[PDB]
Coordinates of C-alpha atoms and ligand atoms in Angstrom, one line a residue:
Chain V
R2 CA 218.8 131.4 110.4
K3 CA 221.8 129.7 111.2
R4 CA 223.8 126.9 108.5
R5 CA 224.3 124.0 110.6
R6 CA 226.1 120.2 110.8
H7 CA 223.5 117.4 112.0
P8 CA 224.9 114.6 114.1
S9 CA 223.7 111.1 112.8
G10 CA 221.1 109.6 115.0
Chain M
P33 CA 251.3 95.2 112.4
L34 CA 249.1 98.5 112.1
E35 CA 251.7 100.5 113.7
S36 CA 254.4 99.8 111.1
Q37 CA 252.8 100.0 107.6
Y38 CA 250.8 103.5 108.5
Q39 CA 252.6 106.8 109.7
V40 CA 250.2 108.6 111.4
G41 CA 249.2 112.2 111.1
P42 CA 247.0 114.4 112.8
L43 CA 243.2 114.3 113.7
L44 CA 241.2 115.1 110.9
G45 CA 237.8 114.9 112.7
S46 CA 235.2 112.8 114.9
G47 CA 231.9 112.4 115.9
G48 CA 229.1 109.9 116.4
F49 CA 231.0 108.0 113.4
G50 CA 234.5 107.7 115.9
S51 CA 237.8 109.2 115.2
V52 CA 239.6 109.6 111.8
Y53 CA 243.2 110.6 111.2
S54 CA 244.9 111.4 108.4
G55 CA 247.8 109.0 107.4
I56 CA 250.7 107.8 104.5
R57 CA 251.0 104.5 103.6
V58 CA 254.6 103.5 104.2
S59 CA 254.8 101.8 101.5
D60 CA 254.6 103.7 98.8
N61 CA 253.0 106.7 100.5
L62 CA 249.8 106.9 99.5
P63 CA 247.5 109.4 101.5
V64 CA 245.3 107.6 103.5
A65 CA 242.5 108.6 106.3
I66 CA 242.8 106.0 109.4
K67 CA 239.4 105.9 111.4
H68 CA 239.4 104.4 114.5
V69 CA 235.6 102.8 116.2
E70 CA 235.1 101.7 119.7
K71 CA 233.8 98.0 119.8
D72 CA 231.4 99.7 122.7
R73 CA 230.1 102.1 120.5
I74 CA 229.3 99.3 117.5
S75 CA 225.5 98.8 117.2
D76 CA 224.8 96.2 114.3
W77 CA 227.3 93.8 113.6
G78 CA 227.5 91.9 110.8
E79 CA 229.9 88.8 109.2
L80 CA 232.4 89.0 106.4
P81 CA 232.5 85.8 103.8
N82 CA 235.4 84.2 106.0
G83 CA 232.9 84.6 109.0
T84 CA 234.9 86.5 111.1
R85 CA 232.8 88.8 113.1
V86 CA 233.3 92.6 111.5
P87 CA 231.2 96.4 112.0
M88 CA 228.4 96.1 109.6
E89 CA 230.2 99.2 108.1
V90 CA 232.9 96.9 107.7
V91 CA 230.8 94.3 105.8
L92 CA 229.3 97.4 103.3
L93 CA 232.3 99.1 102.7
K94 CA 234.0 95.2 101.2
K95 CA 231.1 95.3 99.1
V96 CA 231.2 98.4 98.2
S97 CA 234.7 98.7 97.5
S98 CA 235.8 96.4 94.7
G99 CA 236.6 98.3 91.3
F100 CA 236.7 102.3 91.0
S101 CA 233.7 104.4 91.9
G102 CA 232.7 107.3 93.6
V103 CA 232.6 105.6 96.9
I104 CA 235.4 106.4 99.4
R105 CA 237.4 102.8 99.1
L106 CA 238.2 100.8 102.5
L107 CA 241.8 99.8 101.9
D108 CA 242.9 97.3 105.0
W109 CA 241.3 97.2 108.2
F110 CA 242.2 95.7 112.0
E111 CA 241.3 94.6 114.8
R112 CA 242.5 95.7 118.4
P113 CA 241.2 94.9 121.8
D114 CA 239.0 97.5 121.9
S115 CA 237.9 99.0 118.7
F116 CA 238.4 98.4 114.8
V117 CA 240.7 100.6 112.5
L118 CA 239.5 101.1 109.2
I119 CA 241.9 102.3 106.5
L120 CA 240.7 104.3 104.0
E121 CA 241.6 106.2 101.0
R122 CA 242.3 109.8 101.1
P123 CA 241.8 112.2 98.6
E124 CA 244.4 115.4 98.5
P125 CA 243.5 117.8 98.4
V126 CA 240.1 117.4 99.4
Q127 CA 237.4 119.2 101.3
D128 CA 234.1 117.7 102.6
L129 CA 230.8 119.2 100.9
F130 CA 228.9 120.9 103.9
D131 CA 231.9 122.8 104.1
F132 CA 232.1 123.8 100.7
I133 CA 228.6 125.1 100.8
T134 CA 228.6 127.0 103.6
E135 CA 232.2 128.3 101.9
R136 CA 230.3 129.1 98.3
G137 CA 227.0 129.7 98.9
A138 CA 224.6 128.4 96.8
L139 CA 225.9 126.4 93.6
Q140 CA 225.3 127.3 90.4
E141 CA 223.0 125.1 88.7
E142 CA 225.8 123.4 86.1
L143 CA 227.9 122.8 89.2
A144 CA 225.2 121.4 91.2
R145 CA 224.3 119.1 88.3
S146 CA 227.6 117.4 87.7
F147 CA 227.7 117.3 91.5
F148 CA 224.7 115.9 91.8
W149 CA 225.2 113.4 88.7
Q150 CA 228.1 111.7 90.8
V151 CA 226.2 111.0 93.7
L152 CA 223.6 109.6 91.7
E153 CA 226.1 107.3 90.2
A154 CA 227.7 106.9 93.6
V155 CA 224.6 105.7 95.1
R156 CA 223.5 103.5 92.1
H157 CA 226.8 101.6 92.5
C158 CA 226.6 101.0 96.4
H159 CA 223.1 99.9 95.4
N160 CA 224.1 97.8 92.6
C161 CA 226.7 95.9 95.3
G162 CA 223.6 95.4 97.8
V163 CA 224.5 98.2 100.6
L164 CA 221.9 100.9 101.3
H165 CA 223.7 103.7 102.4
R166 CA 221.5 105.3 104.5
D167 CA 222.7 108.3 105.7
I168 CA 223.2 110.6 102.1
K169 CA 223.8 114.0 103.0
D170 CA 226.6 116.8 102.2
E171 CA 228.8 116.4 105.7
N172 CA 229.0 112.7 104.2
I173 CA 230.6 113.7 100.7
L174 CA 234.0 114.7 99.8
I175 CA 235.5 116.7 96.7
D176 CA 238.9 115.7 95.7
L177 CA 239.1 119.1 93.9
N178 CA 242.1 118.4 91.7
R179 CA 239.9 115.6 90.3
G180 CA 236.5 117.1 90.6
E181 CA 235.2 113.9 91.6
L182 CA 233.2 113.0 94.7
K183 CA 233.2 110.6 97.0
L184 CA 231.0 109.0 99.1
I185 CA 231.5 108.0 103.3
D186 CA 230.5 107.1 106.7
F187 CA 228.5 103.7 105.8
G188 CA 228.3 103.4 110.0
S189 CA 224.5 104.0 109.3
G190 CA 223.9 101.7 106.6
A191 CA 222.4 98.4 106.1
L192 CA 222.2 95.6 103.2
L193 CA 219.6 96.9 100.7
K194 CA 216.8 94.5 100.7
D195 CA 212.6 94.8 99.2
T196 CA 211.1 94.4 102.8
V197 CA 210.2 97.6 105.0
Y198 CA 213.2 99.2 107.2
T199 CA 212.0 99.9 110.6
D200 CA 215.3 100.7 112.5
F201 CA 217.3 104.5 111.5
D202 CA 220.4 105.8 112.9
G203 CA 220.9 108.2 110.4
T204 CA 220.3 112.0 109.7
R205 CA 217.0 113.1 111.1
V206 CA 216.5 116.2 108.9
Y207 CA 217.7 114.2 106.3
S208 CA 215.1 111.0 106.6
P209 CA 211.7 111.1 104.7
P210 CA 208.7 111.6 105.9
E211 CA 206.9 108.3 106.7
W212 CA 210.5 107.7 108.9
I213 CA 208.8 110.2 111.1
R214 CA 205.4 109.6 111.0
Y215 CA 205.4 105.7 110.7
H216 CA 208.9 104.8 111.9
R217 CA 208.7 102.7 108.3
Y218 CA 210.6 103.6 105.3
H219 CA 211.7 101.4 101.7
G220 CA 215.4 101.7 100.8
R221 CA 215.7 103.4 97.6
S222 CA 212.5 105.7 97.8
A223 CA 214.0 106.6 101.7
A224 CA 217.5 107.2 99.5
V225 CA 215.3 109.4 96.8
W226 CA 214.1 111.5 99.3
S227 CA 217.6 112.0 101.2
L228 CA 219.0 113.1 97.3
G229 CA 216.0 115.5 97.2
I230 CA 217.1 117.5 100.4
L231 CA 220.4 117.0 99.2
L232 CA 220.2 118.9 95.9
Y233 CA 218.0 121.4 97.5
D234 CA 221.0 122.1 99.8
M235 CA 223.0 122.4 96.7
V236 CA 221.3 125.1 94.7
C237 CA 219.5 126.8 97.5
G238 CA 223.1 126.8 100.2
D239 CA 221.0 125.0 102.9
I240 CA 219.0 122.1 104.1
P241 CA 214.8 122.8 103.4
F242 CA 213.8 121.5 106.5
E243 CA 214.8 121.7 110.2
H244 CA 211.3 120.6 112.3
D245 CA 209.7 117.0 111.9
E246 CA 206.2 119.6 111.2
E247 CA 208.1 120.5 108.1
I248 CA 209.5 117.4 107.1
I249 CA 206.0 116.3 106.8
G250 CA 204.1 119.1 106.1
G251 CA 206.4 118.5 102.5
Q252 CA 205.6 122.5 101.4
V253 CA 208.8 123.3 99.5
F254 CA 210.2 127.1 99.3
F255 CA 212.3 128.3 97.6
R256 CA 215.3 131.0 98.9
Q257 CA 217.1 131.3 96.3
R258 CA 216.6 131.5 92.2
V259 CA 216.6 128.2 91.2
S260 CA 215.4 127.4 87.6
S261 CA 211.5 125.4 87.1
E262 CA 213.0 122.2 86.1
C263 CA 215.4 122.1 88.9
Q264 CA 212.4 123.1 91.3
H265 CA 210.5 119.9 89.3
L266 CA 213.1 117.3 89.9
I267 CA 213.2 118.5 93.8
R268 CA 209.6 118.4 94.9
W269 CA 209.6 115.3 93.0
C270 CA 211.9 113.9 95.1
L271 CA 210.3 115.1 98.2
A272 CA 206.8 113.8 97.0
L273 CA 205.3 112.9 100.6
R274 CA 204.5 109.3 98.9
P275 CA 207.3 107.1 98.9
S276 CA 205.5 105.7 95.6
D277 CA 205.0 109.0 93.8
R278 CA 209.2 109.6 94.0
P279 CA 211.5 108.9 90.8
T280 CA 213.4 106.2 90.6
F281 CA 217.0 106.7 90.4
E282 CA 216.6 106.1 86.1
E283 CA 214.0 108.4 86.0
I284 CA 215.9 111.3 88.0
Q285 CA 219.1 110.8 85.4
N286 CA 216.5 111.2 82.4
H287 CA 215.3 114.2 84.3
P288 CA 215.7 117.1 81.8
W289 CA 217.6 119.2 84.6
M290 CA 219.9 116.5 84.4
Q291 CA 221.0 116.0 80.8
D292 CA 224.4 117.4 79.6
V293 CA 226.5 116.8 83.0
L294 CA 230.1 118.2 82.7
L295 CA 233.2 115.6 83.0
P296 CA 234.9 115.6 86.8
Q297 CA 237.7 117.1 85.0
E298 CA 235.8 119.9 83.8
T299 CA 234.2 120.6 86.6
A300 CA 237.4 120.8 88.4
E301 CA 238.8 123.6 85.4
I302 CA 235.3 125.2 85.5
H303 CA 234.3 125.5 89.1
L304 CA 237.2 124.2 91.5
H305 CA 240.7 125.4 90.6
Ligands
8MN401 N1 231.2 110.9 108.8 N2 232.5 110.3 108.6 C1 233.8 109.6 108.5 O1 233.6 108.6 108.4 C2 235.1 109.8 107.8 S1 235.9 108.8 106.9 C3 236.5 109.5 106.1 C4 237.1 109.0 104.7 C5 238.3 110.0 104.2 C6 238.3 111.2 104.5 CL1 239.7 112.4 104.0 C7 237.6 111.7 105.9 C8 236.6 110.7 106.5

């Protein structure tokens, strides 16, 4: 697995 | 006169929130952040006490920017033909908590305890001021690396706090609670506690526990890192599937894992300097 950001909305 | 009161520096970032530049207040060399939001992109509007129609983000920032707190404060704001410009505090030096956790991996529990405590105090401050953030996550937390203080940012998905049900949501889905996923309904404080459970897992394990809707509503919490039984218990309590089974903020801060928190200055000296 990779860690990632998650955009709002 | 916006362009004559601040010297604008490089772009710090952009996204769903707008575009944010580094800046310096010309009056006294105070570091600031200058956030631009296009009017056509603003969904929620509100009214300041003066009655002038502004983005809800401005309403909420003004409600929480009085006095000292763990919230990045709104120093001023400007209206342009096609946009609003927000002048915000800028810690220096600074790193957001998402990048910090990426670089450091899972945090020592002593450091996670200090960070999580400060976030709880910041969120309590918001709720005390009648403001629900609705997008608590590591990306929306800044670390003042010299002072060891955490600062909450981005009220662009927030709302006035209320005791009735919310049926709208524009925050981050992987931090949103199972009742939102399942029913498109949540209450403000118990939804916030869920997102704090996600955040605490993120701190002590190095990433969030859930990526998919099925994991969020399944409510099974697997620990990928060694985490004390006391910390596991608090996380699992915050991530209770039924909202009324989640702790209040008082119960979180009275939890055995939360006692003997470091001061911010101690946190910086031991862990950040
Ligand atoms: N989702 N991001 C935002 O709303 C950016 S607000 C902000 C304030 C101060 C600094 Cl140093 C950086 C950013």
